Every structure is written in C-alpha cells, then in structure tokens.
Write a structure and sequence with these properties.
The protein is mainly alpha-helical and 1388 residues long. It contains 65 helices and two strands. The structure holds osmium ion (OS) (5 copies).
Length: 1388
C-alpha cells in the first residue's frame, strides 16, 4: 500500500513542479493517478488494508489543502476505508470501529483540517456508517445525542455542499445536454470551483463514486432517520420566520446527492420501488408529502434520476397517481394551470423559484414520458390532467427561454414513440397553435412563431428537436416509408405547403441564426440538431419507390399507403430539403461545421457534439450525393410542373448556378484535406464517414474535373502537400491497416471496419480514371506528377515504409484458417479487398513498372504461395461447408467467391512475374518460381519448405457440383408478382428492388385486411423464401463467373510456364506429365457438358502437346511411357468430343490441332505400323458421324476452324494409307465421297483466285489443295475427284490465264501465285496418272486448251533484304512448274 501512496505522491509533486508535450503529459499522469486510486480502492475492498494505512491515509486528508481533481480521486478510497473499519459490513472490530470514532470525530486532535469543509464531510460519513452498527450496551442515549450533535454541526460546516460538489464536479460530461440545463445547479455553492485545467474523469471513476454515494445515502436514511426529520422542521418553519436569509438548504442538497447517485443506474433505483415498506420507499413517501417550492424542485430532480429504466419510470408514474397527500400528477397539473394564467392574462412575470419549479416539473414529465410507455399513453390523453393544452397555452405567454424549451422537450417526449393516430392529433394542436395565438392574420402569425422559437440557443435547439421527432414514422425509422411522414391535410387549409414552412425554418436557423450563437459548445449542439433534421428528411424518402413507379409495372396509389405517387413527391420534405442543400449559405455551414481544430477534435470524446456534429455534417453530404441523381431527374421536374399547375410559388433558395451538389463543394478545397486529418484522430464512426465521402468526392466526374483543369497540375494532390499532411495521414492509414483484430469482435470491429473502408476508398478512387494519378496514388506513397508515377528517394516508399507496403505486409501475414473452425469469411474478404487494389496496380501502364519492381524485391509471389491453403471437401468456411443443404445462403458463400477471386489475382501476378523474369533476369527467380510451383522453397536452407503444388491448387473445380443445374424461378412466375428487377446476361437479379416489391404487396394486403391474419404469415414466409431462392441463383451465377475467371488464371499460368521453360529433362518431363495428369480427368469429364471451361483446359493440352518437340535413363523412359498413355486417352476424348459436336467451332478448332499433331509427330520398327493400325481403327470406329463434323467445319464462318478442319482431314487420309503399292482402297476417302465432301471440295475450287488474292484465307486453301493432291494419289481418290468435274472447276476459275499496299515485296507475291499453280499442276498430274488412259483425252485437252502458258513457263526456267533469296525461291517454283508440265506431257 505505502508504495501506492508514495507513487501518487510523486505524480502530484511532478505535476506541480512542472507548472512552475506539456498538455499530453498532464493528460497522461492525471489518468495514471486516477488508476492507482481505483486500484487502491480495490485493495481496501479486500480486507488486506491495515489499521496503520488508515491512520496515515486520514493524515493525508487532514493535511490536504487544495480542492482539486486529485482530491476527488480519493473519495471512493475514503468511503472504502470507512465502510471497512466503520461499518458492520466491513470486518472491523467494534472496539476498533469505536477506536477511530475519536480519531475522526472528537475534534481538536490535529483536527484543524487544512480544509475544514473536507473534515466535515469525513465526520458525516463515519457517523452515518457507524450509527447502524449500534442497532444490534453502554451509553446509547448519550451516544445518539452526541452523534446528532457533531453531525448537525458538520452539515452547517458544509458537509452536504461538499459531497454534492464532488458528485457534481466529478460526473462532468464536458458537453451540455440542453434538455437538463440548469437542473440541480441552483443551490448555493460555498465550494470553490475546480481550476481551469481540462482534466477529465474516467467513465468508470464516476461510477465507483456513485456506488459509495448510494452507501452514504442508504446509510443516513436507514441509520439516521430522526436527523432528517429534525431538518425537515428546522428549515421549513425557519422559512416562515426568516424567509430572506436562505435558511440551510442541506436537505435539498441531500436529494441532489441521491439524484447524482442513482442516475443512469436503474438496478440501484429499484430499491426505491421494490418494497413499499422498506426505509427507502418510505423515504419517497416522506419527502413528497409537503411542497416547499424550492424543496419540491429538489425532489423532482431526484425522481428524474430515479427513472432511467422503463421499470423504474413506470413506478415513478404510479407514484404520482396515488390510486397527507404526496406529490401527484393532480397537484403538478394544477400548478401548471395556475401559472399559465399569471402570464396569459398576475402581470406577465413569474418568481424564479416558482419558474424553476415548473422547469423541474416539465423535466420530470419528459423523462417519465420517454422511458415509460404507460406514462406517455396516460399523460398524452388524460382530461383531468389535460397536458397538451396547458403547456401549449403557457408557451404563448411571456416566459423565460429555458422554460419554453422544457415545454418543447415535453412535446418531444410525447412523440418519441407514437401511432398514426396520435401523430395526426398532435399535428392538429401544432397547426392551430402555429396558426394563431387565440386580426393579426393566420399565416402572418406563423412567421412570428418561428422568429421567436429560433431566437436563442435554448429554444431553437429544443424546438428543432421537436420537429425532428415529429417526422420519425410511427412504425419506426428505417421502415417502409411509403406514406408521407405527416398528414397530407397539414396546412392544406392555409399555407398548402405541408412541412416546407417548418423546413425553411430549420435551414434559416442552420445557415443564418447559428451566427448569433457564440459559445462553441452551444454552436455544435445546434448544428447537430439541424443536421439530425436534414437526415430524418432524406432517409424517409423511398427513392426505390419513385424509380419503380416511374419505370415499371407498379401502381401509383393502389399499392402504397399514400394517396398518390405524385402526392408523395409533392408533400415529402425531400423536395424542399434537397433544394436547400444547393444553397450557398447551407453548404458554407456544412463546411464550417466540419472544419474544426484537429487537436481539440482528437482530444475530445467520440460521443461529444464536437465529433458528432462533424460526423452528421458528413452524413448529410454523403446522403445528398446519393439521392442527387433521383432529385434532379425524377423529383425536381415534378415540383416545377405542379407549382405551375396549382399556381402556388415559394421563394427559390437553391442556386441556379449550381447544376449539381458538387458545384458547391468544388470551391472548398479545405474539405478534402480535413476529411483525411480526421482519420488521424482515432474516432471510428467518424473515419468511416470521412472515407466514404472521399470516395463520392473522388469518384464523381465533376470534382475530379475541377482539381486538374486550370497552370495548376492537380489541385487536390498539391493540397495534401500544402501544410505537409499528405505524408502524416498516409502514415496513419498505415497503422490502421496494420492494427490488430480481435477474433471475438470479428466482422464488426472498429479496426476491421476501418480497414475495409480504406480498401474500399483506395479501390473506388483508383477504378475511376485509372490512367491518371489520383488521390489514392499519392496516399499510397507514389510521387504523383502529371501522367507519371515515381518514388521520391529517402521517401516512405523507397525505404519500404509507404502505405502501399503495408498492404503487402498485411497480406504476407494473414492466416485465414482457424484449425477446422473454418476459413473466417470476414478475413478472406480482407485479403480480396487488398489484392484487387494491387491487381489494378499492375494492369495500368502507370504502376506496373514501379509495382512489379517492388513486388519483386519483397518476394511477394512467395509469401502468398507460402500461406495459400488447399481447397478441400471438409474445409469449412465460417464453420459452413460446401454441398450443405443450402451453402449459397450464408456469408460463407461470398467468402468462397472472394477466395477464388483472390487466387486468380495471384496466378495473374505469377504470370506477369514469370514474363518479366524470362527476358533477362537470372534463372534464380524462374527456378525459385518453378520449384515454388512444385513446392520446394529454400528460404533458411536448414530444410526445403513443402508448399502445395500448382497441381494441388487445381482445387477450384469438381465437375460434380452442378452449380448450373439449380433452377431459376420461371420469368412468368416472377412477372405475375410484378417483379421486373431481373438482370440478364445467365439470369441475374437485383435482390434489393425485388424485396422492395414484396414489401409493398405486404402492406397492400396487410392494411387492406381483406384476408388475414394467418394467410399473411404464410405469404410473409413465401416472400422470405422467394428472395431466398433468388439469392441462391445470383450467387451461383456469381460463383461460376469467378470460377471461370480463375481457370483462365491457372490455365494462362501454365502456358506462360510452358513457353518460358524448355522441356527436355526428366524433372521437367515429369512436371508436364503431372500437369497432363490433372487437366485430363476434368477435360475428359465434361468435354460434352459445356465449352467455356473446356476451352481453357483444351488450350493447355494443345500448347503442351506442341512442346514435346521430340541416350536416356531408365527413369525418363517410364516417364515418357506414362505421357504417351495420357496423350492417348486425350486423343480418344478429343475424338468423342468432335463426333458429338458438343462445343463451339472455336473449341473444336482446338480439338483438330490436338489430333493433327498426334497423327503427325507421335504415330509417325514395325511397332509404328501397329500404332498406325490402332490409331486408324479408332478414328473410323465412329463411322461417318466423326467425319460429318470435320467436313462441314471445313466450310464454316469460322476461318480458324475450317483451316484446322481441312488440315486434320489431310492427316487422316495420310495415316490410313501408311496403314494400308500407291493405288489402294481407303475407307476414309470412300466416306468423304459419300458425305459429298469431295463434291463440294472440287466445286469450291472455282473461286480459287478469289480466295487466293501468308493471308489467312491463303493457308486454308493451301491446306485444301494439299488434300486434293492427297486424294488423287490413289486410284479411287483420283476417280471421286474427277467424277465431280475437276477440269470444269479449273476452267470456270480461270487461274490459268497467263498489288495495292499488300505488305510484301512483289517478288514474294509471285512465288505464292506460282506455288498455287505448283499445287494445281500436281493435282491434275496425279489425277491423270492414277486413273489411266480414261482421262489422257482430258489430260490432252487440258494442255491444248492452255497451250502457250506452258510454252512460256517451259522457256522461262531455261532462258540484299530478301531479293537474292526471293528470286531463288521463285525461279525454283518455275523449275517445279516446268517439271510439273514435263511429267504431265510425258505421262499423257
Ligand atoms: Os416491365
Ligand atoms: Os436567403
Ligand atoms: Os443443412
Ligand atoms: Os506475357
Ligand atoms: Os446479392
């Protein structure tokens, strides 16, 4: 203990020696002194404190001179010592409890306390705590006489004025609740006010005090009743003989001690209402009997604090019913009616004590009316009481401002909760009350009312809080606000403007009359009440309802509770409240509300009006921008068209120069800066509003079109460098995304929620205008100049201190798995929100250079792979498992989605990182990457780390899940419920609008009451089951889009890995076999189902097969033997896939390239002729079906398909002949003639010069003529070719008939032309030779009909960019043609 005392002694001596970095020190130490007190108090409560420490502690109090904050810290420790050694509850010997009675009470034993009032408080406590011990002897009658004497003298010495001063100075909320201004603050105070220091008191220290003050209050009431009943008669009768001296008001101060004690704590206040026979409940009966006007107030200040709970408040309400009279409602309402006549004629004036008594009455009314429903339902409609009329009449007459406020808080307390009936009734009182006093004029009287109520802080803040509550719907805010938030008839008698007269007042206060206010704490609370009003008006506007009625099948009034959709837009304040936000003064008030001292804001409380006045000002700017598009388009033209029909008009408050809310905050450059500096203050809900406003500011075409153009380069960017905060707020965001997270608080934590709000800001800012440097670039640490990034040396980025690196750092530390508790879905979403930023930052040309550079230095590709987990069946997400009864319903679904998107973003980087390496960067990286993709990582070298293989990360597909085979609601079934929110391209949905429609049919049937109540509950379920069905189909559709997107990343990853790394060695030859081992079970499984995924898998198989370009070890053979095994069952599935024609031409074009190479390179000593036989009989096993597909593909719109189809046929005929001298009988050629392919083939030769005019259509025809030649080699082939009139097609073409920017030298264009003739000449040659003399007449007619051309060609052959080579590559084509005609003539 004495160490604790000496520790506190050192703090006070430091703090007093320091007053004779500076402010935060006092803040730091004062709190440390406040903790040691709470810890010492705990120690005394444990019976380990000793009688010795008590004698020393009392000595410190007897010496203590200055009444300060340090003294208050020791009050709970004092009452702990007293309750220990003094009370019987404490285990203190009676002789020892008597022993210290003299040490405290006797006086004249060093009892010249440096603070005489303090010693009076110490003495009063022990007596109250010790007299109860003598309950259950020596000198009882004398002791009690001694007790009451030294107790009464202590009260006059200033005891209760000290205990009350501590209770009042202690629980000092640094913001002034206007509803309880001046309450309990009218009693005289001989105590000197605490010094000017801003030293607060812990939210706990206040509580610990009010616990001991309950023990003090409980002690005096239970142990010293007669002392209180000696004080009732002393001052009550002395009030009549000596009314002027202000006789001892200690009993009043005692009731305020009770008020401060039980305030906020209804658990303790129940001891006053639990047992009516207890001393505490008997006390309320006792104090309420008589009504000394100041003593009544002190009693009502006690009840207001004895009703913080609905249970305590209901009891207090019953206490004033009485159903020797106590104080009752009957008595209160009589005086409320007795003084309303002393004003609305006494002359118009009231006594201060009488006026105060009324305030304590209207304050008790409000409190009991808000906390208890019974009290509200009673007071609001009782005739013997008649509350509404008297308080409304009292407000007409001349009264003090504070009293007129308390009336408005009573009306608010009556409207804090309400029905649609009590709202119309209240508005009938308010209408008449505002229309006339009850000529001065009906509406001109309404002007006088607002000018009064908005005159001072006390009323204006109070009256606006009443107008705020009147617009909160009966069903509760955030309901279906389909009805107007007030009666349509309101004002239709006179002004016809509904609420607008009240709106134009709230903005008149907020924009013009806030300037009359001077106290900053009052200016905040007023602006907070004004902004709370604007919010209530913008939220109750159902914009989803307006777009629906203006766009699709829904009723204007048959459906909604309002009498019309046009009436809804007219009467609702949204029409007018929006117009006000376009006003220059209102906006300049919104900025100056936000603009505040940062250190004063950061050193404040998160609940103080200083913080919330800024939070609420932001919330208005956000909500303004959200509801702006609906306003300017669907709302404003409806008002300017109705006020032209009705002819009515009111003053325009908006600015015609403002075409959008942006135009107002364009000029206020201080706004974007202040929004950042407030994140550095450590107030969460304030931060989230600031960041979400930076999005809508830095994601709007206007404000991003006013920072760049002026000369100025970028205004908002340099504005962060103006005072030098651009780096200090960027440093704060770093500590925010580095901050710790609590698994218990989980998805809704201050740290976690601030992270997502930053990652949503940096992304939302980058996604817009991604090719120009934005705010998000500068805050990330990139040095931002025009259209160019860069790192400033000795800057937070170059030294790896930037925020950007903190996004990497948080990534390489996440553990999104809690050992079979599942992948916490809130945490995998954190990973995605970070990655998608980095993704945008390696796709844009600005960042890819700087980012891919820094991602290399940091080993980013490795840390992600080191932490990536394998997808598995029994791998739960959020505790939920895939393939559950309904997995696509919980927030675990969207967590699996985000994980697939996160994986794809990793493969995409590993791909780009595997291309930036191949060009030059040493094989140390490609080796590291490649082994990291097989699972061999050597960071520390002690041993190689085992990471799952890139083929184990092929875990994002199991073809049996059938996500696409869960049904969608039939579009007519939705249309019959008039649901037209469905989005297309499969079908997607808008859950929100759809659920909005179902809520409007619910109120349509609920209010109509035609069929109820059970049918309602069944419909209430089917709606919840429909939107439950819709959410599954749009999340499944959202999963397939994310799974396919991932397949392209894993697929495209293997491609970049095949082409960079050459495969000739066994360990590599073993890798590609491992790859082929993983894609085949999948591609084989659903090459029939659908194409989109089969295309990506069939594409890695192609590129793979074309990489085995073809002295060995005994292991490499067993490898290749397993590759030839897989390549066969690949060739098989490609054959079955083609024969079915299951995929699009672009996919089968990929199938034909796989078969072509398997027939070209693989199959082509006698073990190869066997391979030809097996491969051949496998093709022709499918009959003409397989050939039909390849044939009609050779004549399709797809140019790449018909080329691969024609080339595949060329290889099919080639391998059947190698299987079967040169004239034989082929089954394939006989099939083609049957399918009429050779017919349409020869007939497609007419436009040979049109198609042949390196060109894509050039190579397709080159494959066509290579096939014709293949056919004409055999006898039957040359027959089927010629039987289709071959020579006829060669004549109608006219190719045998002796250049505008086509990008080749001319010399190469001719050899292509000749090469066409080279092919055509060989085709005719093979045809004449194979058939026989049957076409020697045709072979003769062919030359006689084209003679001369042969003569020129037969003589042309006889006789350095590329020209020498081109002439060689041409003159040889003439040597081939001269030989083509030479072998034709001699064979003819
Ligand atoms: Os429609
Ligand atoms: Os004006
Ligand atoms: Os289940
Ligand atoms: Os590339
Ligand atoms: Os959704």
């Amino acid at each position: 203990i004495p160490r604790c005392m000496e520790a506190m002694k050192g703090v006070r001596s430091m703090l007093q020696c320091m007053a004779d970095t500076l402010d935060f020190s006092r803040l730091s130490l004062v709190e440390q002194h406040e903790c040691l007190a709470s810890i010492l108090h705990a120690a005394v409560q444990r019976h380990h404190a000793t009688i010795a420490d008590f004698q020393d502690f009392i000595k410190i109090l007897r010496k203590w001179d200055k009444y300060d904050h340090f003294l208050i810290h020791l009050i709970p420790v004092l009452a702990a010592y007293i309750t220990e050694f003094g009370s019987p509850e404490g285990m203190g010997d009676l002789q020892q409890a008597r022993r210290l009675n003299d040490f405290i009470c006797k006086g004249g034993d060093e009892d010249s306390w440096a603070l005489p009032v303090l010693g009076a408080a110490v003495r009063a406590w022990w007596i109250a705590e010790h007299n109860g011990f003598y309950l259950d002897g020596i000198n009882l009658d004398e002791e009690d006489e001694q007790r009451t004497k030294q107790f009464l003298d202590a009260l006059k010495e200033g005891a209760f004025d000290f205990i009350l001063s501590v209770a009042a100075d202690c629980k000092a909320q640094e913001w002034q609740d206007p509803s309880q201004l001046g309450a309990r603050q009218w009693l005289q105070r001989k105590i000197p006010s605490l010094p000017s220091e801003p030293f607060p008191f812990s939210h706990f220290l206040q509580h610990s005090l009010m616990v001991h003050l309950e023990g003090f209050v409980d002690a005096t009431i239970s142990n010293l009743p007669d002392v209180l009943r000696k004080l009732r008669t002393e001052e009550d009768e002395q009030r009549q003989l000596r009314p002027n001296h202000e006789q001892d008001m200690d009993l009043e101060r005692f009731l305020i001690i009770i008020s401060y004690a039980y305030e906020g704590r209804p658990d303790a206040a129940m001891s006053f209402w639990e047992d009516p026979d207890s001393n505490l409940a008997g006390f309320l009966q006792w104090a309420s009997r008589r009504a000394s006007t100041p003593l009544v107030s002190a009693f009502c200040e006690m009840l207001r604090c004895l009703a913080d709970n609905e249970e305590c408040a209901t009891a207090a309400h019953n206490f004033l019913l009485d159903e020797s009279q106590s104080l009752t409602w009957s008595q209160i309402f009589k005086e409320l009616e007795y003084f309303t006549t002393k004003v609305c004629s006494d002359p118009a004036e009231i006594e201060p004590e009488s006026a105060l008594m009324l305030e304590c009455y209207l304050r008790l009314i409000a409190k009991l009316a808000t906390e208890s429903e019974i009290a509200r339902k009673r007071l609001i409609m009782d005739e013997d009481f008649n509350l509404v009329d008297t308080i409304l009449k009292l407000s007409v007459g001349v009264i003090p401002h504070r009293l007129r406020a308390c009336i408005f808080y009573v009306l608010k307390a009556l409207m804090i909760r309400k029905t649609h009936e009590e709202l119309d009734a209240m508005w009938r009182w308010v209408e008449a009350w505002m229309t006339n006093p009850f000529t001065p004029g009906p509406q001109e009287c309404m002007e006088m009312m607002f000018r009064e109520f908005g005159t001072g802080f006390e009323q204006s803040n109070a009256f606006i809080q009443l107008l705020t509550t009147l617009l909160v719907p009966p069903e509760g805010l955030n309901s279906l606000n389909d009805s107007v938030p007030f009666p349509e008839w309101l004002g239709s008698s006179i002004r016809t403007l509904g609420i607008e007269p009240y709106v134009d007042f709230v903005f008149d206060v907020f924009a013009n009359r806030t300037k009359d206010i001077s106290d900053p704490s009052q200016l905040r609370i007023l602006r907070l009440s004004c902004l709370d009003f604007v919010m209530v008006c913008l939220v109750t506007f159902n914009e989803d309802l307006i777009v629906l009625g203006h766009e699709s099948n829904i009723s204007i009034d048959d459906a909604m509770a309002a009498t019309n959709l046009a009436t809804y837009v007219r009467l609702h304040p949204f029409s007018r409240v929006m117009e006000w936000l376009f006003n220059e003064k209102v906006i300049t008030s919104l900025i100056n509300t936000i603009h505040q001292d940062p250190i004063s804001l950061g050193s404040a409380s998160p609940d103080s009006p200083l913080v919330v006045s800024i939070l609420r000002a932001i919330q208005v700017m956000i909500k303004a921008l959200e509801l702006q598009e609906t306003y300017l388009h669907l709302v404003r033209p409806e008002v300017l068209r109705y006020q032209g029909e009705a002819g009515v008009r009111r003053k325009p408050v908006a600015n015609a120069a403002y075409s959008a809310f942006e135009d107002g905050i364009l000029s206020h450059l201080s706004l974007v800066v202040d929004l950042g500096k407030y994140c550095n203050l450590g107030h969460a809900e304030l931060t989230l509003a600031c960041l979400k406003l930076l999005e809508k500011i830095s994601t709007s075409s206007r404000i991003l079109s006013a920072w760049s153009p002026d000369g100025h380069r970028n205004k908002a960017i340099v504005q962060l460098e103006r005072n030098g905060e651009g780096e200090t707020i960027s440093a704060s965001l770093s500590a925010s995304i580095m901050a710790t997270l609590d698994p218990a608080l989980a998805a809704s934590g201050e740290n976690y929620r601030v992270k997502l709000a930053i990652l949503d800001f940096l992304y939302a800012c980058l996604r817009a205008t991604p090719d120009q440097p934005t705010i998000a670039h500068q805050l990330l640490g990139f040095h931002c100049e025009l259209s160019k990034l860069g790192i400033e040396p000795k800057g937070p980025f170059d030294m790896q201190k930037s925020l950007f690196h903190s996004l990497l750092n948080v990534l390489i530390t996440l553990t999104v798995s809690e050992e079979e508790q599942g992948m916490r879905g809130y945490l995998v979403t954190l990973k995605y929100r970070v990655l998608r930023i980095l993704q945008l930052l390696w796709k844009s040309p600005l960042s890819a250079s700087l980012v891919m550079d820094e991602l290399r230095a940091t080993n980013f590709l490795f840390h992600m792979l080191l932490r990536e987990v394998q997808i598995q069946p029994q791998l739960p997400w959020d505790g939920q498992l895939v393939t559950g009864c309904e997995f696509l319903l919980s927030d675990a679904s969207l967590a699996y989605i985000d994980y697939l998107a996160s994986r794809a973003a990793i493969f995409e980087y590993i791909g780009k990182e595997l291309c930036s390496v191949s060009q030059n960067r040493i094989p140390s990286i490609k080796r590291q990457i490649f082994d990291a993709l097989n699972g061999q990582i050597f960071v520390d070298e002690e041993a190689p780390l085992t990471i799952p293989s890139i083929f184990d990360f092929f875990d994002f597909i199991n073809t049996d899940y059938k996500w696409e085979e869960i049904p969608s609601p039939h579009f007519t079934y939705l249309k019959d419920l008039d649901l037209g929110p469905c989005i297309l391209e499969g079908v997607h949905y808008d859950i929100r609008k759809a659920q909005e429609i179902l809520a409007l049919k619910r109120k349509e049937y609920e209010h109509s009451q035609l069929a109820t109540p059970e049918f309602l509950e069944t419909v209430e379920l089917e709606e919840k089951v429909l939107i439950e069905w819709l959410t599954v189909r749009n999340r499944a559709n959202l999963l397939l889009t994310a799974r396919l997107n991932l397949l392209q990343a894993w697929a495209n990853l293997l491609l970049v890995m095949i082409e960079s790394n050459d495969f000739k060695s066994t360990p590599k030859m073993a890798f590609l076999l491992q790859a082929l081992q993983a894609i085949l079970p999948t591609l084989e499984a659903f090459s029939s189902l659908k194409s989109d995924e089969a295309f990506e898998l069939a594409r890695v198989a192609k590129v793979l097969l074309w990489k085995l370009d073809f002295g060995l070890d005994r292991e490499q053979f067993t490898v290749g033997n397993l590759i030839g095994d897989k390549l066969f069952q690949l060739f098989q599935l490609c054959l079955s896939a083609i024969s079915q024609c299951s995929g699009t031409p672009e996919l089968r074009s990929l199938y034909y390239s796989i078969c072509y190479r398997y027939l070209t390179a693989v199959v082509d000593t006698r073990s190869v002729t066997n391979a030809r036989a097996r491969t051949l009989k496998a093709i022709t096993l499918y009959g003409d079906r397989l050939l039909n597909v390849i044939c009609d593909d050779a004549y399709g719109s797809d140019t790449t398909c018909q080329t691969a189809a024609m080339i595949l046929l060329n290889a099919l005929v080639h391998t059947s002949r190698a299987s079967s001298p040169a004239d034989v009988d082929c089954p394939i050629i006989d099939a083609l003639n049957r399918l009429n392919f050779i017919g349409v083939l020869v007939d497609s030769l007419k436009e040979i010069l049109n198609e042949w005019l390196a060109s894509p259509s050039q190579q397709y025809t080159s494959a066509k003529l290579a096939l014709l030649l293949q056919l004409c080699q055999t006898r039957q082939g040359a027959k089927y070719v010629l039987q289709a009139n071959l020579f006829r097609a060669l004549e109608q073409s006219g190719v045998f008939a002796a250049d505008s920017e086509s990008g080749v030298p001319r010399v190469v264009a001719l050899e292509r032309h000749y090469a066409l003739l080279v092919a055509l000449a060989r085709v005719v040659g093979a045809a004449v030779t194979a058939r026989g003399a049957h076409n020697i007449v045709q072979g003769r007619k062919f030359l006689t009909q084209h003679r001369g051309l042969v003569v020129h060609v037969l003589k042309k052959n006889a006789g350095r960019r590329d020209e020498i080579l081109a002439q060689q590559a041409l003159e040889e084509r003439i040597e081939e043609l001269a030989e083509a005609f030479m072998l034709l003539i001699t064979a003819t």
